[PDB]
């Protein structure tokens, strides 16, 4: 039998099949305790556990797709949805530390010490696993991979204890505390093996193809408009038809979708209470836009998200600009004009989406409280479903010697580390590209930079990243 | 606090019944595990274990001194070493030791002293 | 740990070293700081992360941190060097330790 | 083959079958003796033998529930007995400490070294599990479990050498000196298993279910009664007939049950000799409570039992209270009124339990002398039976080097430790709960606290338990 | 209790069925005793129109 590392993805005309290998590290804990939080807020504060355990999050998109292999996805197909994904966790090395005293450190290797496993088939512990946090993956396969401690947040009740206004989250009856070790463990041993082999469910597509025509602007640009437009006002109207010019006051049989609170340059747009309890809804909805490049410059939006970096790295909607979206995009009203800035949802409305780039999120997870509406497509990039892939979760083990009868020998916990290979296996159902009859050479396909610093490619750690994300709307429709 | 008072005969060379006693203020002796120890030390030599007493009765003994003395309690913390026709006179001291949990091995050690009495002999 | 145990002072002439000791349980596994107060003065950050020094701070204070104790070696001390050093840790809210006067 | 780290009890409208896994750690002996004793009393001494064995007690019901577990399983079920038990002894990993002279400790892994089992189906060795001692399981499956080392007491010849009045038990003909060493041996070396697969007794169940009526009150509260009741005495009765108000003089057909020194606020009560020997049997009979709460406060008895803490950690027998039973209960006579405080068997009488908890034991033992009465449960909890699961000891070994021909190199036990996983199974026959034409809401189970501080939870080592024991009476039967 | 029974044990509820049977109809009628002022014997011509 042969043990390998696989990586590479493999096209066709129907899905591709992308796999990554990564090393990962599941490093110590020199306490296996909960240790609950102390947060003690004082302005509704958090209350949190902090489990011993190290889940892993592979979510992203750039490490399924090497910038080759993304760019050979957008210049030939026209949609993406996944369908299934595997994760193997590969050979095993867990091992021992035994603290030379006068070295510091000599790492031999164990064959007793193993490596508790669990994954969350069943949904039985809090999913945190697409939100958008600085700890996914290495971006280059060359480095170590260390994965997450494991800790959720709960709801407990509200106290006010301390002397001027000190707010603390003490437990309540719907508290919970998750023990995860009343499971089942794979204890995965050195040179085990273990898979996890998820199945997606069937998601709507991402489109990743822009459009050659404004919405609003679909008809025949000669012959005018069967239909009327008022001149007078005031209980007599005097309707007047149109000629082939009237195209500002041209009729749409659909509307745009909805603008709420979409401005140009905190907190944001936010809900809550008086002025001060205030929670953020950062990156609006997914029907806005945050950045776009107008007549001279770039517009940046308020409810904007960086992506790293500052001066920032966002994804160039040009998309939704064409498609009577945008930053400053006021909506006007007749009424006895009133500039509003929101946009209602207009029974009839198409807002295309925010686009997805190549370091966007795959799920997230939609809540299980119910009446969800549209909850198809996450912000922050990715899908969202209801049981998404489910949580890996990896604790080594407490090998707890050595005693001596009643001493306290030694260190009781004594040192361990384990080392790895994940194998992360996902394929995309592919969709064929959008038909044109179109003579002129579509744009090429090649990552936003500005001079002299080209994208993903070593320098004299080395490997940069461009200024703008790469987006995924380069072909066009033709709508 | 605990503090532990003890009480001293004085001198008697042939062969009587040394009698000693330690009443222990702070916290009365039938109130939980605890031992109380007769220790003795010799003027320049070191310390000397006689034996100490549980509050139900049960006593152990130094296998040296076994048949000479005798630990009793009426919450009174008595010694009763006979046969002193060995001068030994040193020097009396009581103290307690928490009871330990396995009896392999002493997890205590003896934090309560009393102040000493000087028998002679 | 919870508790940072360090010693009372040390004496030292120009010339040599001063290695002091900041005792405490599992600090190996931890981080430790060290401060440097002058009289009448607030205190500097003299070590940080057990082994790096800051740009204000020169290259002759190095420390360790190994097993249960971390260590601060000051190479060839000048006439200035005469501070109560502390060394800091962080066992969930923050330790500070006693203080070796030098 | 997977190995697995098995937890979690399954429910189904017959028995639940609940497992728990620990890590378990047998230490070390620097002596392989036996060590007799010398208590050498002085007012009946003891005498025993200090084996060099571990056994292990899993005996208390609060580590096959969680406490969602326990709570599901009162206030859906009605009854609950064991049926069969495995104890499953996995991965071995005997170690030894090769002392590093300069660090002190340094533990490699021993492929030689074994773990000697043996497992006393026979039941000839004595038998010192179900009595009720701080050493019994982790209550958390995150903590490492330390077995105890096993010893027993004999039975003598009570001497009288000494000076004042020394007594000592020494060795009689009756005596006995078992050494564990002329058994079988399950040599059990790193990665062995071993299993046990005991067999319950057909027991009685323990009625998960109080009652909402009294029984001295089962009658029509209208109606009176067709029998009469004294009058005027002295040879001449005149007896006169009943209405319904005479509740105080109703005739009842079942008497209650015996109340042996029920008493509020040493030995309790207690056999013995003249007043000093007075061995105690501390929790009364098993038909008695020791703890309920009247108009005002908790009564709380001479004869209870802490379970922790102090301040105590009582069950609250409520349902002892409500049937003629409790603590200030006399019983009175009208012989020529006479108050006693005990009440006899009388019988025709009924009494029902003194109601299990979530920290009862389950099982102790009925000693091997004849005629008995009742014994089918017993106190401290549980139920007690004839053949209990037998005990488990866990040895090590002494490998005994090195030697270099005469000499005694080495410390000739050199040192070795074993840590192992003990996955301990147990299934209980639950009963389905008794019918109810009843149109109330029953009361809720959770778990008694009384402020801020919650039941079974990590606060800021962290989880504690609450202040009364969870008792399993609290839905009514209706009787 | 059976509502009781309902949310401790079970996580969603939604109705599949649904019967309606109207029992053992008994239409009857009054004679107004003139005196007493009602007297209500039994009818078996009456009806009851169910639609």
């Known amino acids: 039998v042969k043990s390998m590392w696989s990586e590479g993805a493999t096209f066709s005309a129907n899905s591709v099949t992308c796999t990554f290998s990564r090393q990962f590290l599941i490093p110590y804990d020199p306490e296996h305790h909960y240790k609950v939080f102390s947060p003690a807020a004082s302005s509704s504060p958090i209350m949190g556990y902090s489990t011993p355990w190290r889940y892993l999050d592979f979510n992203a998109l750039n490490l399924f797709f090497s910038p080759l292999e993304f760019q050979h996805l957008i210049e030939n197909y026209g949609s993406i949805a996944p369908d299934a994904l595997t994760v193997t966790i590969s050979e095993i090395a867990v091992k021992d530390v035994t603290d030379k005293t006068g070295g510091g450190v000599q790492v031999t290797d164990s064959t007793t010490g193993r490596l508790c496993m669990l994954v969350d088939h069943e949904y039985k512990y809090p999913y945190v696993l697409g939100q958008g946090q600085d700890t996914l993956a290495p971006e280059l396969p060359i480095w170590v991979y260390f994965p997450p401690q494991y800790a959720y947040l709960t709801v407990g009740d509200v106290n006010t204890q301390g002397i001027s206004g000190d707010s603390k989250k003490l437990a309540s009856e719907e508290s919970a505390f998750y023990v995860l070790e009343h499971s089942s463990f794979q204890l995965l041993g050195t040179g085990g093996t273990a898979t996890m082999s998820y199945k997606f469910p069937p998601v709507p597509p991402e489109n990743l193809e822009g459009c050659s025509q404004h919405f609003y602007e679909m008809y025949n640009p000669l012959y005018g408009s069967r239909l009327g437009v008022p001149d007078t006002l005031g209980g007599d109207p005097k309707f007047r038809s149109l000629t082939h010019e009237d195209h500002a006051i041209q009729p749409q049989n659909f509307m745009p979708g909805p603008l709420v609170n979409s401005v140009s340059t905190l907190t944001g747009l936010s809900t809550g209470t008086s002025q001060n309890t205030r929670i953020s809804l950062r990156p609006g909805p997914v029907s806005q836009p945050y950045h776009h490049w107008d007549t001279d410059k770039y517009v940046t939006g308020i409810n904007a998200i960086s992506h790293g970096q500052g001066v920032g790295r966002f994804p160039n909607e040009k998309e939704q600009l064409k498609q009577l979206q945008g930053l400053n995009m006021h909506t006007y009203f007749p009424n006895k004009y009133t500039d509003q800035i929101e946009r209602p949802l207009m029974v009839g409305s198409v807002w295309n989406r925010r686009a997805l780039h190549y370091e966007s999120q795959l799920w997230s997870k939609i809540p299980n409280l119910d009446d969800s509406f549209k909850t198809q497509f996450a912000a922050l990039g990715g899908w969202g479903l209801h049981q998404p892939p489910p949580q890996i979760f990896l604790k080594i083990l407490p090998q707890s010697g050595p005693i001596g009868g009643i001493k306290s020998m030694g260190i009781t916990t004594l040192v361990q580390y384990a080392v790895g290979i994940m194998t992360v296996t996902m394929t995309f159902k592919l969709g064929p590209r959008k038909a044109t009859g179109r003579w002129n050479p579509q744009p090429g396909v090649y990552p936003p930079h500005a001079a002299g610093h080209l994208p993903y490619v070593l320098y004299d750690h080395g490997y940069e990243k461009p200024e703008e994300l790469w987006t995924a709307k380069s072909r066009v429709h033709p709508l | 606090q605990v503090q532990l008072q003890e009480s001293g005969p004085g001198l008697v060379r042939p062969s009587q019944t040394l009698s000693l006693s330690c009443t222990v203020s702070?916290?009365?002796?039938?109130?939980?595990?605890?031992?109380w120890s007769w220790i003795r030390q010799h003027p320049g030599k070191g310390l000397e274990w006689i034996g100490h007493?549980?509050?139900?009765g049960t006593v152990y003994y130094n296998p040296s001194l076994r048949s000479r003395v005798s630990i009793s309690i009426d919450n009174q913390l008595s010694l009763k070493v006979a046969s002193v026709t060995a001068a030994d006179t040193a020097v009396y001291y009581c103290?307690?030791?928490?009871?330990?949990?396995?009896?392999?091995?002493?997890?205590?050690?003896?934090?309560?002293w009393g102040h000493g009495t000087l028998v002679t002999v | 740990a919870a508790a940072l145990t360090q010693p009372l002072s040390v004496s030292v002439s120009p010339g040599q070293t001063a290695i002091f000791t900041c005792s405490g349980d599992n600090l190996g596994d931890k981080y430790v700081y060290w401060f440097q107060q002058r009289p009448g003065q607030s205190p500097a950050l003299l070590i940080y992360q057990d082994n790096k020094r800051p740009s204000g701070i020169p290259e002759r204070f190095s420390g360790s941190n190994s097993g249960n104790t971390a260590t601060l070696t000051i190479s060839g001390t000048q006439s200035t060097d005469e501070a109560d050093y502390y060394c800091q840790t962080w066992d969930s809210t923050v330790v500070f330790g006693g203080g070796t006067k030098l | 083959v997977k190995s697995m780290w098995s937890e979690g009890a399954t429910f189904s409208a017959n028995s639940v079958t609940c497992t728990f896994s620990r890590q378990f750690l047998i230490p070390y002996d620097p002596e392989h003796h036996y060590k007799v004793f010398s208590p050498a009393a002085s007012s009946s001494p003891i005498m025993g033998y200090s084996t060099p064995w571990r056994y292990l007690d899993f005996n208390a019901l609060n580590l096959f529930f969680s406490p969602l577990e326990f709570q599901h399983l009162i206030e859906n079920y009605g009854s609950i007995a064991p049926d069969a038990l495995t104890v499953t002894i996995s991965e071995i990993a005997v170690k030894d400490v090769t002392d590093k002279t300069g660090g002190g400790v340094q533990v490699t892994d021993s492929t030689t070294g074994r773990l000697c089992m043996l497992v006393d189906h026979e039941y000839k060795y004595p038998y010192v599990l179900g009595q009720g001692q701080d050493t019994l399981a982790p209550e958390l499956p995150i903590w490492v479990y330390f077995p105890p080392q096993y010893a027993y007491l004999t039975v003598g010849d009570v001497n009288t050498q000494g000076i004042s009045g020394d007594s000592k038990k020494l060795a009689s003909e009756e005596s006995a000196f078992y050494v564990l060493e002329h058994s079988s041996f399950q040599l059990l070396g790193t990665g062995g298993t071993a299993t046990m697969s005991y067999k319950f007794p057909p027991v009685p169940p323990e009625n998960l279910e109080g009652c909402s009526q009294h029984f001295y009150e089962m009658y029509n509260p209208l109606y009176g009664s067709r029998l009469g009741v004294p009058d005027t005495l002295g040879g001449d009765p005149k007896f006169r007939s009943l209405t319904h108000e005479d509740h105080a003089i109703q005739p009842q057909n079942f008497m209650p049950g015996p109340l042996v020194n029920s008493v509020s606020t040493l030995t309790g009560l207690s056999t013995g000799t003249s007043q000093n020997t007075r061995i105690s049997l501390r929790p009364g009979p098993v038909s008695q409570p020791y703890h309920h709460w009247d108009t005002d406060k908790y009564v709380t008895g001479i004869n209870a039992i802490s379970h922790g803490q102090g301040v105590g950690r009582f069950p609250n027998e409520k349902e002892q209270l409500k049937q003629l039973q409790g603590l200030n209960m006399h019983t009175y006579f009208p012989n020529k009124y006479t108050d006693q405080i005990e009440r006899p068997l009388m019988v025709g009488s009924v009494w029902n339990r003194r109601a299990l908890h979530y920290e009862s034991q389950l099982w102790s033992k009925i000693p091997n002398l004849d005629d008995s009465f009742k014994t089918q449960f017993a106190a401290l909890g549980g139920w007690g039976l004839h053949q209990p699961p037998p005990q488990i000891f866990l040895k090590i070994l002494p490998q005994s080097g090195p030697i270099g021909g005469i000499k005694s190199m080495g410390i000739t036990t050199l040192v070795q430790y074993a840590v192992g996983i003990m996955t301990v199974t147990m299934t209980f026959k639950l009963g389905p709960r008794k019918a109810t034409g009843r149109w109330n809401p029953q009361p809720g189970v959770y778990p008694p606290h009384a402020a801020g501080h919650l039941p079974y939870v990590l606060y800021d080592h962290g989880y504690e338990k609450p202040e009364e024991l969870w008792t399993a009476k609290s839905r009514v039967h209706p009787l | 209790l059976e509502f009781q029974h309902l949310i401790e044990n079970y996580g969603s509820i939604a109705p599949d069925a649904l019967t309606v049977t109207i029992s053992e109809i008994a239409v009857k009628d009054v004679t107004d005793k003139t005196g007493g002022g009602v007297q209500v014997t039994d009818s078996t011509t009456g009806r009851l129109c169910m639609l």
């Open positions: 007493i549980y509050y139900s």
């Open positions: 103290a307690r030791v928490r009871v330990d949990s396995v009896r392999g091995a002493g997890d205590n050690g003896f934090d309560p």
């Open positions: 702070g916290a009365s002796i039938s109130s939980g595990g605890y031992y």
